[PDB]
Amino acid sequence: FRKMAFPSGKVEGCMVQVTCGTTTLNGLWLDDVVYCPRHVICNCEDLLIRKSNHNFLVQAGNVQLRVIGHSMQNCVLKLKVDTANPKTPKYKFVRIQPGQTFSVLACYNGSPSGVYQCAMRPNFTIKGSFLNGSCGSVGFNIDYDCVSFCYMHHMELPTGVHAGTDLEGNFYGPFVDRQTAQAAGTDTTITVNVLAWLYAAVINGDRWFLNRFTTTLNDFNLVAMKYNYEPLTQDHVDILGPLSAQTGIAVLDMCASLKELLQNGMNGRTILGSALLEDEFTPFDVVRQC
Amino acid sequence: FRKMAFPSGKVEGCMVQVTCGTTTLNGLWLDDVVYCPRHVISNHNFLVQAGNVQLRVIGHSMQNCVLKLKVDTANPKTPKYKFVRIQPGQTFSVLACYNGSPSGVYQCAMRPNFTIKGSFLNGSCGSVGFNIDYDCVSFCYMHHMELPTGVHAGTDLEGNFYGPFVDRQTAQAAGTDTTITVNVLAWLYAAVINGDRWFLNRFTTTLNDFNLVAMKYNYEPLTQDHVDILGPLSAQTGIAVLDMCASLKELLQNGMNGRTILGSALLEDEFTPFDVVRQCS
Ligand SMILES: COc1cccc2[nH]c(C(=O)N[C@@H](CC(C)C)C(=O)N[C@@H](C[C@@H]3CCNC3=O)C(=O)COP(=O)(O)O)cc12
Ligand SMILES: COc1cccc2[nH]c(C(=O)N[C@@H](CC(C)C)C(=O)N[C@@H](C[C@@H]3CCNC3=O)C(=O)COP(=O)(O)O)cc12
CATH class of the missing domain: 2.40.10.10 (Trypsin-like serine proteases)
Structure with missing residues (x-):
């Protein structure tokens, strides 16, 4: 079981370089439009009205694409080019x-x-x-x-x-595209993913954290909230259905294992080679791979 | 630090399937040759497909445990x-x-x-x-x-197994594994680069003395090639390789002591010196 990315070729054929003034960064070329962060022109709307198409230098490999239009959508700049990308997926x-x-x-x-x-x-x-x-x-x-x-x-x-x-130019989270030191909200652990990963562990022969106990959903959520874990919903329980089906371990059974790990630690042991509880695999990520 | 793969597009363009009988596996199509495991087994016994498009086989040979199928089309996506x-x-x-x-x-x-x-x-x-x-x-x-x-x-792509394994349907056992010393050293250099340098000491060691100690902790001995590939990191930090070895020796003999390096109490041994420079530079 490995953290696994999608094959990247369909996206590689869309990456270009966008230059404006002394600033350069990457852009995404889909059909006849290049999307890139609007920071490349650095109120921002007045900064954009003062630019012409020829101020933007867009290179795909060593070939220069000709910008024939431009607009802004939130924090993303959209550059129309006179060449369509044939590699557009x-x-x-x-x-x-x-x-x-x-x-x-x-x-x-x-x-x-x-x-x-x-x-x-x-x-x-x-x-x-x-x-x-x-x-x-x-x-x-x-x-x-x-x-x-x-x-x-x-x-x-x-x-x-x-x-x-996102590709409409709206930030995830309370951040802005300015050169300032910004703090995020308090992070929490993705409970449904930790459980998906524990199921992945059982599918791969790691079983030392399993126990005889079962918990109720509300009792599990009380402990989870105490350890800064996200609440588990019935929808999460459903989504975990196939993994519980494959392993024969009820979801609320696995929750009792997680509760014990949270309260007793791992005592120096590991799970899937990790000394920490992993929360960056979704239930689908586990299914798609296993 | 993330485990980062290379962009895969240049290899994606070379993947085909090879079928002999009921057995299908993957093949690598470079120029007019397709490389695949010989375990897949006349030219017309081989079904090579790029997607659903058949590539006509015009010759075949075996090199160690790999089959080389000559096809009539040179792969235009060959990097x-x-x-x-x-x-x-x-x-x-x-x-x-x-x-x-x-x-x-x-x-x-x-x-x-x-x-x-x-x-x-x-x-x-x-x-x-x-x-x-x-x-x-x-x-x-x-x-x-x-x-x-x-x-x-x-x-490898010449069909020679890494290690003492063979392409038979048989339960084979690897040798007992060891920790990749050169990579742990690269990881300590990465920690130094990022300001986490509590473990640096004022001792040094000879390569041979370090190697004999390392093997008692199930660490690999260093080769001269290992010392050489640590050169760039050594110059960047100004910490001699043998001085870093002496620091690692103390960590082996004394432990972390509830201290961390780059956030973890476990040493990482799957980042090469090139990987460290890749991610820090
Ligand atoms: C006072 O200021 C600060 C204080 C404390 C922390 C801070 N952090 C940032 C920041 O991140 N600033 C953005 C630009 C703003 C306008 C959104 C930036 O620098 N983004 C990089 C990617 C970055 C570069 C390093 N690792 C990355 O991921 C680009 O790629 C574009 O900049 P470049 O032209 O390529 O250098 C500013 C800042
Ligand atoms: C009794 O015998 C055993 C006992 C205990 C352990 C054992 N292990 C193997 C083995 O490894 N067998 C090879 C075939 C030989 C000729 C090398 C194999 O490689 N199977 C997969 C890849 C594997 C399959 C699942 N995950 C993978 O990595 C292929 O891809 C080709 O086989 P397929 O035609 O695709 O099924 C045999 C064996």
């Missing part, structure tokens, strides 16, 4: 929910650099790996050749976690 | 590429594939016992591992087998 723009996962394609100067999986934290940050020049890198999921784009990268907080927008 | 044989401790990206269709990408490290900690199901054989340097893909792994302990084993 079937795609959608989606706004993901906290606790869901996606693949990030880290890019620099329009060149894809690395790929890895992230979860949208409850406090709407992501624990990524991004350096100077990564702005405009995107996050996505792939379902049957359709790429659903959900994240465009903008900033790194003082704590080292990351913040960005 | 600049090399076949390389990696050493234990080196990392690479795996593109997990089923029936010629890529499924996911993740980073693996070759253990000293020549296994990797993969995520592979039935139908994954022929999936490859690779590194990408300046648009050139160095292929280093082709997947063949899951051991009874859940770890995985395979060959």
